[PDB]
Design an enzyme around this catalytic site. Structure first.
Site, PDB file in Angstrom:
ATOM      1  N   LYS A   4       9.664 172.763 -22.402  1.00  0.00           N
ATOM      2  CA  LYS A   4      10.998 172.316 -22.779  1.00  0.00           C
ATOM      3  C   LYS A   4      11.271 170.884 -22.364  1.00  0.00           C
ATOM      4  O   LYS A   4      11.909 170.145 -23.110  1.00  0.00           O
ATOM      5  CB  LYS A   4      12.058 173.230 -22.158  1.00  0.00           C
ATOM      6  CG  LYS A   4      13.456 172.658 -22.191  1.00  0.00           C
ATOM      7  CD  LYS A   4      14.337 173.283 -21.129  1.00  0.00           C
ATOM      8  CE  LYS A   4      15.074 174.487 -21.670  1.00  0.00           C
ATOM      9  NZ  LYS A   4      16.081 174.995 -20.706  1.00  0.00           N
ATOM     10  N   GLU A  30      21.696 171.440 -11.044  1.00  0.00           N
ATOM     11  CA  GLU A  30      20.252 171.501 -11.195  1.00  0.00           C
ATOM     12  C   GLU A  30      19.557 171.560  -9.840  1.00  0.00           C
ATOM     13  O   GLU A  30      20.048 171.024  -8.845  1.00  0.00           O
ATOM     14  CB  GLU A  30      19.759 170.293 -11.989  1.00  0.00           C
ATOM     15  CG  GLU A  30      20.173 168.976 -11.386  1.00  0.00           C
ATOM     16  CD  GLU A  30      19.094 168.376 -10.536  1.00  0.00           C
ATOM     17  OE1 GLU A  30      17.918 168.668 -10.806  1.00  0.00           O
ATOM     18  OE2 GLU A  30      19.415 167.628  -9.595  1.00  0.00           O
ATOM     19  N   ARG A  31      18.406 172.226  -9.812  1.00  0.00           N
ATOM     20  CA  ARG A  31      17.609 172.292  -8.596  1.00  0.00           C
ATOM     21  C   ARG A  31      17.007 170.930  -8.298  1.00  0.00           C
ATOM     22  O   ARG A  31      16.379 170.321  -9.164  1.00  0.00           O
ATOM     23  CB  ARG A  31      16.495 173.322  -8.740  1.00  0.00           C
ATOM     24  CG  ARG A  31      16.949 174.717  -9.063  1.00  0.00           C
ATOM     25  CD  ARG A  31      15.752 175.618  -9.265  1.00  0.00           C
ATOM     26  NE  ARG A  31      16.152 176.952  -9.683  1.00  0.00           N
ATOM     27  CZ  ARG A  31      16.484 177.273 -10.925  1.00  0.00           C
ATOM     28  NH1 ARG A  31      16.454 176.357 -11.876  1.00  0.00           N
ATOM     29  NH2 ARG A  31      16.839 178.513 -11.216  1.00  0.00           N
TER      30      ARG A  31
END
Lengths: 161, 52, 54, 103
Positions: A4, A30-31
């Site tokens: 992705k 987000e991580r």
């Protein structure tokens, strides 16, 4: 599993080449590990240039270790840095939102902190208007356009959530 | 008192007018729209229609 | 005998293929003519109202 | 535009078995021309200067543009094809007249 990040980077590249449009990538909730991974993958694949002025994307990140206010306004920060390109350069900007469900849930946490009464399932009472006041700025004006690619998480695999 | 300055002492609001008209002309046409047009025409194809 | 007569009737009706060729040619050129008319009409009005709009 | 009266499978009785595709292809093209002429009108709707003289601020540009318009010769298409098919039809009339005489 499926690639992705490659699709995102290729959309950035194409839209920058076919049209003249720059891109913005918002990192709602987000991580930090995945943010660093994406930064280095976009440096490697040439979309970001650390030594020239030929970078095709601006990055805005609100990580997961940030208060709900940050994670809720980071998508608007990315939206603003894209709206500049659209309304002051006539470009066709590409705005990515690496997860829109975390935007929704950060708004939910914010409204919970402010003492408001939750709604169906627990989301904010202002869920629809909070989503709308953001998504309504991703439009095609007479000056340019902003096209948004928003990664979606479906909680509990219920498309009616 | 603005016949000496078309848009009343601006030296601004032009940087965007050029872009807006750019779009305007760009898709109103893609030629010298100020001009009158000269016309190239094309006429139909045809084949063997008698009994082969 | 009756087969001969039927063949005669068919070969009498023969001329429709040629008159259909005629009709198709006529219609095609008429369509092209009116398309040219509207082409030039539309485009000169387009120049005019471009000037008006600007 | 003068047209000829047409039956359709009366046109298919006479068509041989070597050019059926050609035949109904001409049929399809005929239908394309039917609907296409039926769609648009004969002449374009002429345009009024009063709305175009009292609007344009350019010096006489309306008048000279539309003068070039009202002084324009659009190239009328020419047939160049009906005569040859008419002669072909005459020749076939001859051929099958003698056929029917023999028969």
């Amino acid at each position: 599993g499926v690639g992705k990040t490659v699709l995102i980077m290729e959309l950035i590249n194409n839209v920058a080449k076919a049209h003249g449009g720059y891109s913005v990538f918002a990192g709602v909730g987000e991580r930090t590990r995945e943010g660093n991974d994406l930064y280095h993958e976009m440096i490697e694949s040439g979309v970001i240039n650390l030594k020239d002025a030929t970078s095709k994307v601006a990055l805005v990140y609100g990580q997961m270790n940030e208060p709900p206010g940050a994670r809720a306004r980071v998508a608007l920060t990315g939206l603003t840095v894209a709206e500049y390109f659209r309304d002051q350069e006539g470009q066709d900007v590409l705005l990515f939102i690496d997860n829109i469900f975390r935007f929704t849930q950060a708004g939910s946490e914010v409204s919970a902190l402010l003492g408001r009464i939750p709604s169906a399932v627990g989301y904010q009472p202002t869920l629809a208007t909070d989503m709308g006041t953001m998504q309504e700025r991703i439009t095609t004006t007479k000056k340019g356009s902003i096209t948004s690619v928003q990664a979606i998480y479906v909680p509990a695999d219920d498309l009616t959530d | 008192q603005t016949s000496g300055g078309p848009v009343d002492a601006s030296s601004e609001y032009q940087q965007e007018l050029e872009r807006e008209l750019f779009k305007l002309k760009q898709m109103f046409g893609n030629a010298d729209m100020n001009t009158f047009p000269t016309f190239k025409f094309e006429d139909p194809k045809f084949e063997v229609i008698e009994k082969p | 005998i009756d087969t001969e007569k039927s063949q005669q009737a068919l070969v009498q009706k023969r001329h429709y293929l040629f008159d259909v060729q005629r009709n198709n040619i006529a219609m095609a050129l008429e369509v092209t003519y009116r398309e040219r008319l509207y082409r030039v009409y539309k485009e000169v009005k387009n120049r005019l109202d471009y000037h008006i709009s600007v | 535009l003068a047209l000829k009266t047409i039956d359709w499978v009366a046109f298919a009785e006479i068509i041989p078995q070597n050019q059926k595709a050609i035949a109904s292809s001409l049929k399809s093209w005929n239908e394309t021309l039917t609907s296409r002429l039926a769609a648009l009108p004969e002449n374009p709707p002429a345009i009024d200067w009063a709305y175009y003289k009292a609007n344009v601020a350019k010096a006489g540009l309306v008048d000279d543009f539309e003068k070039k318009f009202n002084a324009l010769k659009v190239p009328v298409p020419e047939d160049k094809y009906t005569a040859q098919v008419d002669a072909e039809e005459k020749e076939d009339v001859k051929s099958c007249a003698e056929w029917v005489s023999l028969s």
